[PDB]
């Protein structure tokens, strides 16, 4: 509703002080800012966005908001050259998506290790010493093992990465989920819990509840915890992560960035609420104060927070990671690994198993979510040389093992498709997308009477 | 060519837990919606939840404190439980597949059903 | 949840009548309402989605209509095997609820 603001933020995060900012924009113009916490808000906000029933402002990390930029669901911002020098340029950086700018940064995100002085006086340097520690105690530690964010650092500590980032542009034909590192990486987690270390269905809930109740020894989770540790009164410590094989763990760098809805009517409201409340020292120590954001992008208040040793101790396991990416493919990169995880710790499947389906569904399958009415552009890149004077064509797939029905074929209703041969681009064009059109659709290179996958694409519909 | 068989407990007695299994054949639950609904008897349909082609749940606020639905991909089997069941319970229970594969929720309507089980909560 | 009511709760005709079935849903459902046939002791089939489209095999004399918030099934020839109980379901909301059914029977 035009006069009005509603922001967005996940349930982990302080939105206590968030609300007291609200309260000091409502008082100096008038306008009544809402702000929610809906729950699973990294996919509930597509759904809802385009609609027009949907937030103005949606605070998530930065590696969902090239999927949400590709779509058109978020609006370019022109933060005036002065006030981008408020923020680290290295924030800017990670909210830059094809030169769009398209969110602020707010603040960096990035896992430590916490363990409690009363269970564990000097934290283990290695990973591999941690069973034995588990014996003694016997708990050594506890930490989200549903969400892949938690446990990929271990994944990565061996060499594993996502995609290849060649010259500040990411190669998405190069996925390591299966790589040298990542097979001995994950296996190490699976025998913590086939020994009885940790358990299968252990989630975020449970390692809150258990760590500040002095259960564990251990666990592993972001700034934002720190304040519901404080209250449990345990004297808890913020240290670097344990090293797996000699190498550090490379937990993944989350910067948390504030997005503008491309259809809410208040983005200038939005703007001046964000530029000369939300990044101002005021604005932040009052979110702060409610949950820790860790390192913020404002310098000057960095300057202040850098000080606190447990912000110094998450820079330091973030210095030895990497940033996220911010490609659209990073979703699907995500729930790969996420199913990947969950089946080697029940033991349903094994760990060669689980990365080979996972390495497998992240390559060459970006997700495709488009408005609904409005048209989706699909790019298909291919070797113009392997797949020179062939026809291609653009089919759905019925079933995991059915047939894929040809759509349309190049050299139909409410698609078309061009072919770029020169160049390696197969286009296809999706006018007034509607419902019932999402449906898993190949791109392929026809030869004879036989076809090759050149990139299976996942297209979603928004509700528009 | 799939077809979906029901089996469990089907008498129980107040405050038990409710565990019913429903075996598919002939597909994997990627790519479409499997639900639960129950009807009791001489009454309507009722939702009790449903899963998505992403593994994500989705439950009936009027049963999200007592149900929980998970899926077993090595026997292809996915169960219904109901923690704190009580008479009011008594109904029919039916697991039903959506039939989009990748397609949108609003026509995942259930098109393929099992034979339901009887489930007689009593003391 | 959004609530979903049917009306007639009972109805009798004979073969060959022309019926309709009204659905009426709480709050805007846009055109994605779902209507099922339901004989006594067999499990529910789907014979309508989105309002308008038959699923495969159902016979040309099922025929769905309605958008937003009202929504009608016609049977423009009944047949003996279309009696039974007849219920909707909207597929809008995240919980997918139904109506209170439509119990088909034979004049006489």
């Known amino acids: 509703e035009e006069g009005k603001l509603v922001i967005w933020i996940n349930g982990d995060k302080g939105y206590n002080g968030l609300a007291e900012v609200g309260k000091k924009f409502e008082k100096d113009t008038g306008i009544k800012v809402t702000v929610e916490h809906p729950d699973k808000l990294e996919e509930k906000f597509p759904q809802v966005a385009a609609t027009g029933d949907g937030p103005d402002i949606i605070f998530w990390a930065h590696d969902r908001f090239g999927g949400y930029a590709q779509s058109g669901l978020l609006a370019e911002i022109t933060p005036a050259a002065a006030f981008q020098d408020k923020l680290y340029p290295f924030t800017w950086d990670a909210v830059r998506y094809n030169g769009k700018l398209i969110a602020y940064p707010i603040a960096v995100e990035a896992l430590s290790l916490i363990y409690n002085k009363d269970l564990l006086p000097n934290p283990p340097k290695t990973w591999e010493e941690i069973p034995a520690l588990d014996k003694e105690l016997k708990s050594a530690l506890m930490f989200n093992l549903q969400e892949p964010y938690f446990t990929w650092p271990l994944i990565a500590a061996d060499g594993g990465y996502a995609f290849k980032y060649a010259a500040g542009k990411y190669d998405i034909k190069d996925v390591g989920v299966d790589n040298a590192g990542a097979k001995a990486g994950l296996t190490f987690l699976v025998d913590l819990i086939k020994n009885k270390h940790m358990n299968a269905d252990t989630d975020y809930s449970i390692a809150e509840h258990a760590f500040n109740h002095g259960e564990t020894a251990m666990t592993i989770n972001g700034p934002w915890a720190w304040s519901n540790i404080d209250t449990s009164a345990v004297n808890y410590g913020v240290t670097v992560l344990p090293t797996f094989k000699g190498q550090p763990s490379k937990p993944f760098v989350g910067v948390l960035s504030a997005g503008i809805n491309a259809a809410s009517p208040n983005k200038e409201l939005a703007k001046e609420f964000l530029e000369n409340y939300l990044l101002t020292d005021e604005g932040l120590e009052a979110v702060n104060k409610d949950k820790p954001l860790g390192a913020v992008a404002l310098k000057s208040y960095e300057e202040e927070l850098v000080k606190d040793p447990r912000v110094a101790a998450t820079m330091e396991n973030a210095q030895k990671g990497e940033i996220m990416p911010n490609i659209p493919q990073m979703s699907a990169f995500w729930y790969a690994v996420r199913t990947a995880v969950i089946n080697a710790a029940s033991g349903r499947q094994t760990v060669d198993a689980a990365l080979a389906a996972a390495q497998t569904n992240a390559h060459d399958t970006t997700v495709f979510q488009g408005v609904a009415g409005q048209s989706l552009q699909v790019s298909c890149p291919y070797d113009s040389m392997k797949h020179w004077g062939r026809r291609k064509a653009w089919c759905r797939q019925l079933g995991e093992k059915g047939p894929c029905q040809r759509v349309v074929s190049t050299h139909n209703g409410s698609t078309a498709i061009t072919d770029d041969t020169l160049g390696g681009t197969l286009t296809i064009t999706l006018r007034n997308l509607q419902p019932h059109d999402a449906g898993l659709y190949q791109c392929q290179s026809l030869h004879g009477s036989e076809a090759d996958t050149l990139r299976k694409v996942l297209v979603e519909v928004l509700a528009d | 060519q799939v077809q979906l068989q029901q089996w469990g407990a089907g008498l129980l007695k107040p405050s038990e837990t409710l565990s019913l299994t429903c075996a598919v054949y002939g597909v994997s639950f990627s790519g479409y919606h499997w639900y639960w609904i129950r009807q009791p008897p001489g009454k309507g349909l009722e939702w009790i939840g449903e899963i998505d082609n992403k593994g994500q749940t989705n439950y009936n606020p009027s049963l999200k404190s007592r149900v929980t639905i998970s899926v077993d991909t090595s026997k292809n089997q996915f169960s219904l439980k109901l923690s704190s069941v009580t008479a009011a319970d008594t109904a029919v229970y039916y697991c039903?597949?959506?039939?989009?594969?990748?397609?949108?929720?609003?026509?995942?309507?259930?098109?393929?059903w099992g034979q339901g089980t009887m489930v007689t909560v009593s003391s | 949840d959004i609530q979903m009511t049917q009306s007639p709760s009972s109805l009798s005709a004979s073969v060959g009548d022309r019926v309709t079935i009204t659905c009426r849903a709480s709050?805007?459902?846009?055109?994605?309402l779902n209507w099922y046939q339901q004989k006594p002791g067999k499990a529910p089939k789907l014979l309508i989605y989105?309002?308008?489209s038959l699923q495969s095999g159902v016979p040309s004399r099922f025929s769905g209509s309605g958008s937003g918030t009202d929504f009608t099934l016609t049977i423009s020839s009944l047949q003996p095997e279309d009696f039974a109980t007849y219920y909707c379901?909207?597929?809008?909301?995240?919980?997918?609820?139904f109506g209170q059914g439509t119990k088909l029977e034979i004049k006489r």
């Open positions: 989105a309002a308008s």
């Open positions: 709050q805007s459902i846009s055109s994605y």
């Open positions: 039903a597949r959506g039939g989009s594969y990748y397609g949108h929720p609003y026509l995942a309507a259930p098109d393929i």
């Open positions: 379901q909207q597929s809008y909301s995240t919980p997918y609820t």
